[PDB]
């Protein structure tokens, strides 16, 4: 089937087969939870519909990728317009991961939505990551072997210690869906805003952050060795605060 | 008549390319049509441009 | 959409045959009179649009617009003659044949000043519609494509007078209008030029083939 | 207040366009066909009347009368075709285009001694009304103030006739005639000399803006 | 008393003795004036505030001023973005003319607002007036002796004649307010969309033109001897059709 949703419509969602993060639908602030008493309305389905960043390559030696949320949709048409002329925000979403293969190609991917994922930096000693590299926009970031700039300033590099210190095989324990090529071909995850306060600026601060690992790694006879990774994002639930003039 | 600014654009773009197993054609074909809708209508008759003759149509 | 009727699209008046006649000396008979089948695929605009559809079905308005040119010598007032010979029936093949007074056919007099002539014919094929194509052939195996049961008779004229006769041409506009139409299974546009009546025929010789269809250098750009 | 109305006002018939046309010996088609854009803005008193409103709307009734004169040889008799194209349709370029037989557009034969033509003709833009002013450009940014929507047509004329043609005169005096009028948003008199059609320009040059005010001495005498 | 519409609040309103153009209210497009068929819906309250533009210096030598719709607008917030990124759209106003002056200044305006107003060209001959001076944006056009460029291509500058060889005092035949400084001290019109069409492109097309022509000399003997005319308008029931993908 197909999810049509605002002018966006994506084929091939099927079924909700999907998972639900920690149980809870994305919803609107309700106004007990609600930071300045409460507002009259935030009503606006304007937002809502699907963002497809383009289709990142898998290969035979792919190690993983990783985008964060709201970032990645900075530059996403109204959703992305609508976070740089408000200082507040808060939003939900519903990822969709999926690529194309056939029935002679076999891989795993892990599909996990990490709240608050603290990145660790590359180098030793007193170092940090810098704004810049956790802030890629929807490119995403890609696990590479070469060396890059203000070193000190990069993120790790170490998939497999979910890039944070801990162990790859553990992230089960974060909303997740496999996507065994032999079996399915894509995952969905609806999650809601995750944070301790009602809204956040989301320029400083990424609540959500995308991660995929291959897992089994991708392999196949065919003539081009290398698959399509496509990604499909939506708000949920969008709600922005202290609007200020654009065109300015 | 045609217009340019006054006319829509229909685009056809890769999402994705065209993902195949092994001893397969690395090529497909892509076919498109189109018709009218319920409230398509037309008004006014012409003289249709899409056919000019210009021979003798000899009996 | 009633202008998207087959009555509103085929049902327009549109002039079928030019038919000129011109006075001759030598002898009074000669070939003065003239005589045209009726055929509603002469004119490529018209045809196409009849071809639009396999078979159809209608009755007809003729409408006379006769236009005397004296290049000399007055001779105003003349009479004219236009006969209808109804499929079948004998052609005239002089200007005093017996057919200008037989009735069976039917006659319009028409003398100068007097409103344009006009009359009506019914539905004529033997058939229940006429064919607008045909993939069959004659019962001698010949001249396939065209149909016997779709003749419509033919349009006769002659000059009645007799003398005043000096050396003055007529043409007479024929204005023909398919009136309470039917038609049945449509058909793709003509998509080139005709060569041949009753025939489907579209190579033209030393000529390459032109469509409809204009060439565009990528198809990226619109 | 009856003949306050609109109705009144508009809806008398007034001569929109003289058409003349002249037999020329040199090539029997040459330019003898005659080809006029319908528009009502050509004559000054008619054209202030519409022109007291922002949009109008209405249907019209064209009546066309004939006027042949003969320098010598006699020709008396010749046959007049008047063609209306409806907008959009291509016009003739041609004593014998094609455009003079096709049934799309509207013909009117007349021959001298005949009731003048007539015929009637439905509000024709694309848009609800006509536009008698319009504070807008073309697509190209360019001819600001003409409205494509209020395209009429044309008239077209040709002698039908063929070598009677002993280099006659044709004079077509065209009628059109408002007919259940409206109108929207009055405006102020046009209160200087038109200079433009499609255009309020009123500046003239070494001439000084001259209006219908009439000055006096002193204004404590009327 | 004062007008909130919006984020936006002009004080010095007051009662309602204001004009209605042609005594339509500003209304949405009806299904049934629609040009396609219908459109389920186009509720939107955001462009409806009040755009306030610069205030114009009146002098004792000031012979007039216009502006036109939605040409004017082009440039404010939202109302200008919609405009432009979308390919039709229709509108009513509320202008709302006020001058600040004493009871030791004497005066009278016309404000007159004009469908149609097409504008005649300022040379003779075959000459025409060009797209830039018909629109001037919010800054409007101010009679002037001084000689210009494109001279061709400019406008008349005789205020008299209405801009297009009509008499000025039968320009009361339009929708308008005179604001007779020993009086009122402001004018207010409220108009509905006009046009021959359901919708337009407000690039190449102003309905409305917004005419003020000083019918009685300011005089005063104060110290500066001029007084400010500011201008709000706000947008009445706009719509728009045709959106087109924006930060492009």
Known sequence: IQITRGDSTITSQDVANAIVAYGVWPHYLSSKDASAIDKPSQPDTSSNRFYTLRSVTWSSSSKGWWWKLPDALKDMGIFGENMFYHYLGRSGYTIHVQCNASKFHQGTLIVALIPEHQIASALHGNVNVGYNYTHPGETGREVKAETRLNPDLQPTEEYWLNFDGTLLGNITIFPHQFINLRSNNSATIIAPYVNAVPMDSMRSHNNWSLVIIPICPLETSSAINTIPITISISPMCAEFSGARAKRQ | ?59 | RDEMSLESFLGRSGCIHESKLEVTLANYNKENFTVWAINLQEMAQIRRKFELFTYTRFDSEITLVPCISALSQDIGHITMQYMYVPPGAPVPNSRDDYAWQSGTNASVFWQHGQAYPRFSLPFLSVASAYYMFYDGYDEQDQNYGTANTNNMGSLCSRIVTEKHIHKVHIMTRIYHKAKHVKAWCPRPPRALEYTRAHRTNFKIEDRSIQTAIVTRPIITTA
Chains 1, 5 share one sequence.
């Open chain 2, 1 to 59: 008549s045609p217009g340019r600014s006054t006319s829509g654009y229909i685009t056809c773009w890769y999402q994705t390319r065209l993902v195949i197993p092994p001893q397969t054609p690395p090529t497909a074909r892509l076919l498109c049509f189109v018709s009218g809708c319920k409230d398509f209508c037309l008004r006014m008759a012409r003289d249709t441009n899409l056919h000019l003759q210009s021979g003798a149509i000899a009996q």
